[PDB]
Nucleic acid binder design. Structure first.
Ligand code: CL
Ligand code: CL
Ligand code: CL
Ligand code: MG
Ligand code: MG
Ligand code: MG
Ligand code: MG
Ligand code: MG
Ligand code: MG
Ligand code: MG
Ligand code: MG
Ligand code: MG
Ligand code: MG
Ligand code: MG
Ligand code: MG
Ligand code: NA
Ligand code: NA
Ligand code: NA
Ligand code: NA
Ligand code: NA
Ligand code: NA
Ligand code: NA
Ligand code: NA
Ligand code: NA
Ligand code: NA
Ligand code: NA
Ligand code: NA
Ligand code: NA
Ligand code: NA
Ligand code: NA
Ligand code: NA
Ligand code: NA
Ligand code: NA
Ligand code: NA
Ligand code: SR
Ligand code: SR
Ligand code: SR
Ligand code: SR
Ligand code: SR
Ligand code: SR
Ligand code: SR
Ligand code: SR
Ligand code: SR
Ligand code: SR
Ligand code: SR
Ligand code: SR
Ligand code: SR
Ligand code: SR
Ligand code: SR
Ligand code: SR
Ligand code: SR
Lengths: 145, 115, 119, 246
RNA sequence: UAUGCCAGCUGGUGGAUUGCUCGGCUCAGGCGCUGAUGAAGGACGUGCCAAGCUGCGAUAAGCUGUGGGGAGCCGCACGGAGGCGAAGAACCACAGAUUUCCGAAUGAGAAUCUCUAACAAUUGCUUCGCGCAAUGAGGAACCCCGAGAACUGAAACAUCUCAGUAUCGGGAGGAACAGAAAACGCAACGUGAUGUCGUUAGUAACCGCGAGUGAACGCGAUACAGCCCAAACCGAAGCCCUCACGGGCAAUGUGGUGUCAGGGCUACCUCUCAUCAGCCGACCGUCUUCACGAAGUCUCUUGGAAUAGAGCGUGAUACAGGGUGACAACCCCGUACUGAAGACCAGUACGCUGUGCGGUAGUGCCAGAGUAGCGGGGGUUGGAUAUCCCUCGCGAAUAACGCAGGCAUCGACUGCGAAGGCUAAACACAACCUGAGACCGAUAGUGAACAAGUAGUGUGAACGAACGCUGCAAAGUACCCUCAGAAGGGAGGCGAAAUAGAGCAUGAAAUCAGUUGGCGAUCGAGCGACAGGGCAUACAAGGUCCCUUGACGAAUGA
RNA sequence: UGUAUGGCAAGUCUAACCGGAGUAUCCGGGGAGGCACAGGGAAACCGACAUGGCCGCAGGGCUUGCCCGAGGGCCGCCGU
């Protein structure tokens, strides 16, 4: 039996005095009203913060950790098997509406991998080079000088 | 009120095994199953590989999911398993329903609880 | 349609020619065998037999067929008024069965004996 | 498991395996949810006139004539919820969403669970069906869809001892209440479901309470009418096979 | 025991309750213009007796014809009298006749009338004659162009909000508007008319940066469709009226050509199936209407009545629904299946007829101005410098040129040709039609189930109810008595039932009369709760209760 | 924005709309896009512990105090 169901015969319905549940006064204004005065509480200060750059001049990268590539190697046998050669561009989903494919270095690399992507971090490299492998850049990743 | 009739049966089966036998885990698992779905165990393999030992049954008071790698020959026991978890477990062990483990281990011995 | 409201509505607010079907009654064994039907529109010359009222098991000639109110008057199916006069009792056709027909009309005799049409 | 196939005379004509989906756990909680979400989805939007009771210029005369401040026009109290011929305060609305969303998998799994509830002989007798048979569901050969007469289907169901169900679902209840005044005067018990493969059984559909279906679209409501599992279904050999990939 | 109090009883008063539904409410599909050939609306008429309503119009609840229909009929509405109908009536579908006056109202004036040939008024064409034509006004909403509030919110308030909402002025159609890029700008080697749905997104943007306001490109979908002038170059090769003769138009340019796959002119390749005009013109579907259509009206009991119960039997591509003296697949209409017509889709698609698509080189022949653009003032938008618009001032280029790509100038690159035009289909609305319902069920639901926009209120604009139910059948109470009496009353009659007898199914409460139990004219007031005595009580649905004695025997306790 | 329940789970849900049909139910298709899967920075831009240490509840083991100790707690280290 719900709360609303037990409210008949209670007169005030949990509202205290019948002088309470009226108009905007019981609320303290309308909507967001009184945001600087009596209701400054748990409200962000008055003012502008920073700037925005035009949306078509904004770059959105395709993020993927070395941990995700490594956990799924046995499952990804549809890609090249060398002395593992894998094109990261064909692994990440949402690779069509993204600017470039960047490989992030978070986690462990228990295997030998030959990674092919647009951009790499200093950490993505150190974790693949120190675990027996190469990092080969794409022809689009040549915008780094 | 638990809407599921078979979670309510599993709990009843876990309760009888805690009483009629020498179980001290099956009743503890049933006590976590009675508690809300948000408090239930949602666990991946990357935790079963880090904390489980071989020849020791792994008991999960919820559902087992499939993110991460499992290399150990552990026999995992849960309420439910994700279709990818069970594929990744039967590859290097055995995914057993908690409802089997009650008949297969009514004493509830040599068992680790993972969440 | 299938709604009780719209069903009774069509039966009451029915044009005069469509009220013909409202005064239909079942045919006897001999008559069903002969004309290939089960029922017929009752006529003022027809003879008939009562199956459901207080007057069940009595025969008589159909003296009137009122389409407007959708009922029939049959001979000897009377009611005695206070002044001793014997006024007719209106009968439903669905409570009656035809023993003998009136084929005085050439069009009705033509419509009944034709397997394509139904009178 | 094995399913015993029948011919149009009522004798055994071989047997084929009963598909995997009939070993799906009977979950009345998911079945019942899939039926309530189906029933409510075909429910029509109602609502009283938006302007009812408001079609008046009624005004109150303030404080002075010794009467309560109620809007009046010609000595009659109009508009306000408390006044006779006034507006409904919180009336039924047309803007309301009377539709229930249900995740595809939950509905699919519920069909499977209801479809499976058809395999257990005890559940079918617990649901209400009157019959004398150990093997359930009834499995009939594809030569069933060719039958045209209903009286011949009766003879098949009389031979299969499964007619005491249509004898049960013959009686009609005349509903208590004003449902009478809206079209729903009668109601009858749900009976046998005839699942075919090409076209629904034009030959069976007139039988007392019997619903007819096809394995490409036989839903939870057909399998479990009113959320109650275990309907005494009768499949066609090609239906029992086609119903597997559902 | 007078006045009187509490409870009940019979009978009223009252019309709640239960049951019922000719009405409502909402959703969905279909459909969708009318009018000077005088609409829509109105007034007055129109019947054997006719007040209301419905219909109709001096031919007046109706006249003709074709088809359907059929023994009956003369509306609502059961009278009396009379009539019509086998010469095929009633009824229905289609086509037509008639169709008073006021009414856009149009000869002129007028409260529906009157006065001595009338497109009144304004236009087009014009035989310059009202000769041939056009506009006018209506319609639930939807649509398009204009005009454009305040309450309210911001906790006051002024910019802002409410909101381009309300209301007002103009106008079109079955839909409207939009529309084949001087585009987009996921900048690309990319998309490729327009609406609309989903999403993009409460994003970008705006804003006393507060309250709040709020796109788009793209994407997925619905539906698809693409063309015509101006000019160049031809220059009367042309158009309109008329049966014709004839007339009118037009060099201030009709007609040809041509229209960013730029075109034209000059010189060649080839060829058309594009395109424009015009003929033909559905299938399928959908929607509405119709034809046809299975099986009991058997047995006994109850009953006023079988649609009940028990027994026997039956069809079902039909067990949706309604009717019928009670619970009906087999009594009646229907329902499934099958088939027929109309409308809509649609003058569309398909086909056909004519035409002719296209390419190469040469040529600064042609390509829409107060325009593009700048400045001042206003307004509006998300438009931020970078929205669209009005207003005042100023004002250009000619494709070898110009506009654009979210600040301006310059060059590049990319895209695209303004200032001329047309355009099917996909969506809006719900008057109209049919259908549907976990909506309402007569103080509800529409204001309106009834005389409903009725009665009735106001000078007027405008405001506005209440009223549902005899019975299976009127069998709607003969006769007698009484009375001043078609009253009412009594007796009596019908029906299962008159306490069903006319606002007549049931018949609550407040309350009234008569009456029963209790109390009662020396007595004190939240009317009672709990205890306990008097008196009162037919049955049923409750069956316990008193005393001697005895067993048990807590705290307590002689 | 919480909570209870249920399905799926490193993924999850389809919207409009299309097909089917027993034709508003219902069955198939539809993943456009939304949320989650990495954060820090106004921006440019860069880009993290599938576990290193110490406690220790529940539970398990043992030769019955001693072990293993999920979740938890206290630190490290890591990205910006
Ligand atoms: Cl930014
Ligand atoms: Cl995890
Ligand atoms: Cl594009
Ligand atoms: Mg015949
Ligand atoms: Mg009202
Ligand atoms: Mg009313
Ligand atoms: Mg009721
Ligand atoms: Mg005049
Ligand atoms: Mg204010
Ligand atoms: Mg503004
Ligand atoms: Mg302020
Ligand atoms: Mg605005
Ligand atoms: Mg844009
Ligand atoms: Mg031309
Ligand atoms: Mg009465
Ligand atoms: Na209150
Ligand atoms: Na894209
Ligand atoms: Na009104
Ligand atoms: Na008063
Ligand atoms: Na709705
Ligand atoms: Na229409
Ligand atoms: Na005119
Ligand atoms: Na009259
Ligand atoms: Na007329
Ligand atoms: Na003239
Ligand atoms: Na305020
Ligand atoms: Na003020
Ligand atoms: Na402001
Ligand atoms: Na009858
Ligand atoms: Na604007
Ligand atoms: Na200007
Ligand atoms: Na552009
Ligand atoms: Na009333
Ligand atoms: Na997606
Ligand atoms: Sr409250
Ligand atoms: Sr302040
Ligand atoms: Sr995508
Ligand atoms: Sr009539
Ligand atoms: Sr009548
Ligand atoms: Sr005063
Ligand atoms: Sr006009
Ligand atoms: Sr197109
Ligand atoms: Sr041009
Ligand atoms: Sr620029
Ligand atoms: Sr009343
Ligand atoms: Sr006045
Ligand atoms: Sr009497
Ligand atoms: Sr006192
Ligand atoms: Sr004692
Ligand atoms: Sr999905
Ligand atoms: Sr930890």
């Amino acid at each position: 039996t719900s709360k609303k169901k037990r409210q008949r015969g209670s007169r005030t319905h949990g509202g205290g005095s019948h002088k309470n549940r009226r108009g905007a006064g019981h609320r303290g204004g309308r909507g967001d009203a009184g945001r600087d005065k009596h209701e400054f509480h748990n409200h962000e200060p008055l003012g502008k913060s920073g700037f925005k750059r035009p949306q078509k001049v904004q770059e959105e990268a395709a993020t993927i950790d070395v941990r995700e590539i490594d956990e799924n190697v046995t499952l990804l046998a549809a890609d090249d098997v060398a002395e593992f050669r894998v094109d990261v561009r064909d692994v990440v989903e949402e690779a069509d509406d993204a600017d470039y494919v960047k490989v992030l270095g978070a986690g462990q690399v228990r295997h030998e991998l030959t990674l092919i992507a647009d951009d790499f971090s200093e950490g993505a490299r150190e974790k693949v080079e120190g675990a027996g492998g190469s990092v080969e850049l794409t022809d689009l990743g040549e915008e780094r000088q | 009120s638990k809407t599921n009739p078979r979670l309510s049966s599993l709990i009843a089966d876990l309760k009888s095994a805690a009483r009629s036998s020498g179980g001290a885990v099956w009743g503890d698992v049933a006590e976590r199953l009675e508690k809300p779905r948000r408090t239930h165990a949602e666990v991946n393999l990357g935790r079963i590989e880090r904390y489980a030992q071989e020849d020791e049954t792994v008991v999960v008071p919820g559902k087992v999911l499939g993110s991460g790698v499992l290399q150990k020959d552990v026999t995992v026991a849960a309420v439910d398993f994700s279709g990818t978890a069970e594929t990744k477990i039967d590859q290097v062990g055995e995914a057993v329903s908690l409802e089997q483990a009650i008949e297969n281990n009514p004493e509830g011995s040599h068992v680790r609880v993972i969440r | 349609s299938k709604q009780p409201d719209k069903q009774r509505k069509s039966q009451r607010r029915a044009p005069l020619h469509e009220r013909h079907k409202q005064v239909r009654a079942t045919l006897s064994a001999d008559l069903r065998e002969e004309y290939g039907q089960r029922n017929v529109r009752v006529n003022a010359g027809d003879t008939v037999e009562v199956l459901r009222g207080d007057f069940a098991g009595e025969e008589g000639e159909v003296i009137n067929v009122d389409l407007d109110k959708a009922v029939i008057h049959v001979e000897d199916v009377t009611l005695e008024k206070t002044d001793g006069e014997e006024v007719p009792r209106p009968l439903d056709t669905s409570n009656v069965r035809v023993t003998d027909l009136d084929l005085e009309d050439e069009k009705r005799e033509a419509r009944l004996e034709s397997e394509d049409d139904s009178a | 498991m094995q399913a015993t196939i029948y011919d149009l005379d009522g004798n055994t004509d071989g047997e084929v395996d009963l598909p995997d989906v009939f070993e799906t756990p009977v979950r009345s909680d998911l079945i019942g949810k899939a039926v309530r979400a189906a029933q409510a989805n075909r429910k029509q939007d109602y609502g009283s006139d938006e302007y009812a009771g408001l079609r008046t210029p009624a005004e109150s005369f303030g404080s002075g004539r010794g009467q309560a401040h109620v809007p009046k026009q010609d000595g009659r109290a109009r508009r306000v919820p408390q006044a006779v011929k006034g507006r409904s305060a919180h009336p039924p609305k047309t803007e309301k969403d009377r539709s229930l969303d249900l995740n595809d998998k939950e509905r699919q799994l519920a069909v499977r669970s209801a479809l499976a509830a058809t395999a257990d002989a005890d559940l079918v007798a617990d649901r209400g069906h009157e019959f004398d048979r150990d093997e359930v569901p009834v499995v009939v050969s594809d030569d069933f869809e060719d039958l045209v007469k209903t009286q011949e289907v009766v003879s098949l169901l009389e031979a299969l001892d499964v007619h005491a169900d249509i004898d049960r679902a013959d009686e009609t209840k005349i509903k208590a209440g004003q449902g009478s005044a809206r079209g729903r005067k009668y109601r009858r018990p749900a009976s046998i479901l005839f699942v075919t493969s090409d076209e629904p059984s034009t030959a069976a559909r007139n039988l007392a309470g019997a619903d007819v279906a096809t394995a490409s679209e036989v839903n939870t409501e057909d399998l479990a009418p009113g959320g109650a599992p275990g309907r005494l279904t009768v499949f066609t050999e090609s239906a029992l096979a086609e119903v597997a990939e559902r």
